[PDB]
Design a protein around this ligand. Sequence first.
Ligand SMILES: O=C(O)/C(O)=C/C(=O)C1(Cc2ccc(Cl)cc2)CCN(Cc2ccccc2)CC1
Ligand SMILES: [Mn+2]
Ligand SMILES: [Mn+2]
Length: 181
Amino acid sequence: GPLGSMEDFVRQCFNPMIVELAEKTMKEYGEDLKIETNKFAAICTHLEVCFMYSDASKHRFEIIEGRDRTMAWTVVNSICNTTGAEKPKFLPDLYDYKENRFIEIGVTRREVHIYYLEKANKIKSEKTHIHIFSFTGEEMATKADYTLDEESRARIKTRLFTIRQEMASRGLWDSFRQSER
Ligand SMILES: O=C(O)/C(O)=C/C(=O)C1(Cc2ccc(Cl)cc2)CCN(Cc2ccccc2)CC1
Ligand SMILES: [Mn+2]
Ligand SMILES: [Mn+2]
């Protein structure tokens, strides 16, 4: 069985805007994508989940992820000052104008409950809502409030399953799955 290149997979299967944003994220944080290829794929995946989440209800969410860090904080600060929402310690992924809170989206190859608990421990912010997706279709969310309806979330999970499946088809999944953290 031939083993493909992860960089090849990423460029072939993600939208080039997502790829470009992922590249900029890596360069901004001092990482070489040509070595950290699995991480590159993870960043693309996470970005795409954030975009899909926002697109599940247009005009409802402000996107924070994918912006350069300074701009991301500028947007967070502006939202806080405008809405009175409390300022988070760490950069979140979205702001929910409807439920009036920031959202952290996690995408993991690990056990969802543990991943959730780790994120919730690190945020140190009872404000930011946490929503975790795994590639296995499992999910976990703050207060068992999943924000979006089953169909939107099904769309996200299906995309994740498709990614995992294409990766396994190229022999990329075994390494990707265990390179996390
Ligand atoms: O873990 C996430 O899903 C995620 O969005 C993390 C982040 O946005 C970082 C912000 C952050 C958010 C939450 C937590 Cl618990 C710790 C850090 C900022 C640099 N960011 C780069 C980055 C963005 C997305 C995916 C991986 C890395 C990482 C730290
Ligand atoms: Mn983020
Ligand atoms: Mn996130």
